[PDB]
From a paper:
[name] (TS, EC 2.1.1.45) is a ubiquitous enzyme that catalyzes the reductive methylation of 2′-deoxyuridine-5′-monophosphate ([name]) to 2′-deoxythymidyne-5′-monophosphate (dTMP) using N5,N10-methylenetetrahydrofolate (mTHF) as a cofactor. In cells, TS provides the only synthetic source of dTMP necessary for DNA biosynthesis. TS works as an obligate homodimer, having residues from both enzyme subunits that contribute to substrate binding in each catalytic site. TS subunits are characterized by two domains, known as large and small domains (LD and SD, respectively).
The structure of [name] in complex with the substrate analogue [name] (Ki of 1.1 nM) was determined to 2.08 Å resolution. In both complexes, the two subunits of the [name] homodimer adopt the active conformation, showing that Cys195 is exposed to the catalytic cavity, as occurs in previously reported structures. [name] fully occupies the [name] active site, perfectly mimicking the interactions entailed by [name] in the substrate pocket. The 5-fluorine of [name] forms an additional water-mediated interaction with the Tyr135 hydroxyl. [name] C6 is positioned 3.09–3.29 Å away from the Cys195 thiol, which is the same distance observed in the [name] complex. On the other hand, in our complex, [name] mimics the substrate, placing its 5-fluoro-uracil C6 in an optimal position to form the covalent adduct with the reactive thiol of Cys195. In contrast, in the [name] complex, the [name] uracil is shifted far from the isostructural Tyr135, and a water molecule mediates its interaction with the fluorine of the inhibitor. A comparison of EfTS and [name] complexes shows that, in [name], the orientation of His196 prevents the inhibitor from lying closer to Tyr135, whereas in EfTS, the sidechain of His198 (corresponding to [name] His196) is rotated by ~70°, allowing the direct interaction between the fluorine and Tyr145. The superimposition further evidences that [name] in [name] partially overlaps the cofactor site of EfTS.
Residue numbers in the entry:
A (entry chain B): 26 to 310
B (entry chain A): 26 to 312
Amino acid sequence: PPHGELQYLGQIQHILRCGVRKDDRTGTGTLSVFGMQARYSLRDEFPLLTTKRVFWKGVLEELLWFIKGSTNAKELSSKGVKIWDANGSRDFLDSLGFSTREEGDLGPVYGFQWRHFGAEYRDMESDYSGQGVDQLQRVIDTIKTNPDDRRIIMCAWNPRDLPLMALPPCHALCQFYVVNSELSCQLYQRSGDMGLGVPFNIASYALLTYMIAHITGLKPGDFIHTLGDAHIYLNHIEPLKIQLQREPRPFPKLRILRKVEKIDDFKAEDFQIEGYNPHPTIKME
Amino acid sequence: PPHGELQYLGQIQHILRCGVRKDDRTGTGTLSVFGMQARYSLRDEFPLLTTKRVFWKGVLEELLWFIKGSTNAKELSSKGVKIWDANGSRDFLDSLGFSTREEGDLGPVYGFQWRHFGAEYRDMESDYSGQGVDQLQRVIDTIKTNPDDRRIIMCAWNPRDLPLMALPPCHALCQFYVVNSELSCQLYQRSGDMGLGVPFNIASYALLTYMIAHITGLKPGDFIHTLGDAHIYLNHIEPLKIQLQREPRPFPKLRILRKVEKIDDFKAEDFQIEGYNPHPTIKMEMA
Ligand SMILES: O=c1[nH]c(=O)n([C@H]2C[C@H](O)[C@@H](COP(=O)(O)O)O2)cc1F
Ligand SMILES: O=c1[nH]c(=O)n([C@H]2C[C@H](O)[C@@H](COP(=O)(O)O)O2)cc1F
């Protein structure tokens, strides 16, 4: 069977071959395709891309932060992961017109939507217990009680809350599916920077599937990634061509180190990537 | 150049060969694949399937009803289209524990979520003006002013509102995309009855894209159909095998008959399907 990575690499090649030039919200330029889909086996392997190092600690730490329901960049920052720090800075907030906001306050982005969808956002320090729909606990409950259900969805796209967020979500929704004791997940990603974002994003949702599989006693099945605007920044086309020469090495395995009963009880040291041997690290703006 | 109907037919074959048996809430049994995606050109052709007659009057009438923001099965019924009638009936409403509610009252389904997302649903007769987000007008505005936008989304999946709905939306969200003066659309469909629902669902969203292209002065591009649980009900197998042996005839064209200024302005008789001559209707039992 071909390496799972060839799916991502063949997406890159497709956008180079067939993507069209499209300007962007910043002004750097992209090659773009609309509508793509790839399937990554989660069976006895973990699709952490090998042809360039993926920031695994960021993936895991960010996901734990979502699961907590945090909308405070500082709480992620204190764990050594700075990827949301800019969006919560004083200048950034002011330039969205959020001048009365405390620094760190991303507004109602993924952690809030996942744990408290539909509640009124107040600030990042407010008490939201028992408010809004806990979609993440809902998905886990349905998987255990009704695995056949075709409505196992967690949605982060909330039109009312869109103007309040520091950044509109890229991961608009995901869906879970159970057959034959195997849990699968499909992510609808509205916009994917193929060089810098997508490898990270594939890791997050594969990891979210391993976690829910572990707690519901199921085996990980497939991760299906669906893209809206799939794009390569003009200034990555060269770096990417470097990457396309590299032979994928076999994906690592993901080990969960103890038996965990509730999604909230997971911690970073619960997880060990085994046998990750990626190619030479490649920097990208 | 291969016929676009082969995309749909290919999917049927894929599920028959590789789908796994999976029970559903309806007790019927299905063969199921999770995650599929097909692409339909809208360039000078409209993908209304030809290997069986599709209910076009239904497609068009149901979309105009969504657009008007109606949640009243009776308003669609009066136009001759009965597909939401069962869901807005005494017996059914009762069985969802909505003893209180009036016949026709589907709750906050597509029409409400498209024009009033996040507003407080009362009943099917309330005036919702200026409440919730008008995601449909918002898509149109963004297309006119900033066609490069990677956020042109319309979502009908509203966790908060699911308890009040006659049933949860199959069409969870769509996304629009513009390049080279061409408007494309991607539907995320969480659950697809490949026999009975999908051919209709393809024509609904192809039609919505033609409409929005018309008012924004763009040309229709591609319709990308993404599926979650793509399934065939076991009692559809025999009729789909008959369908698989028919030869696709050329897709029709869709014509819009006047220049139209606002999406709320379109009426049924503004549209003409031209050259639609399908293979006969194929009855398939509802689950
Ligand atoms: O998790 C993410 N992954 C990702 O690839 N992007 C990329 C997509 C796009 O290149 C940009 C966000 O911009 P826009 O809102 O215009 O699509 O970031 C953003 C994320 F949050
Ligand atoms: O537009 C639709 N298309 C469709 O294919 N279904 C099918 C999918 C599934 O067979 C059933 C809805 O069931 P559930 O909610 O269990 O997925 O109806 C329903 C619609 F409204």
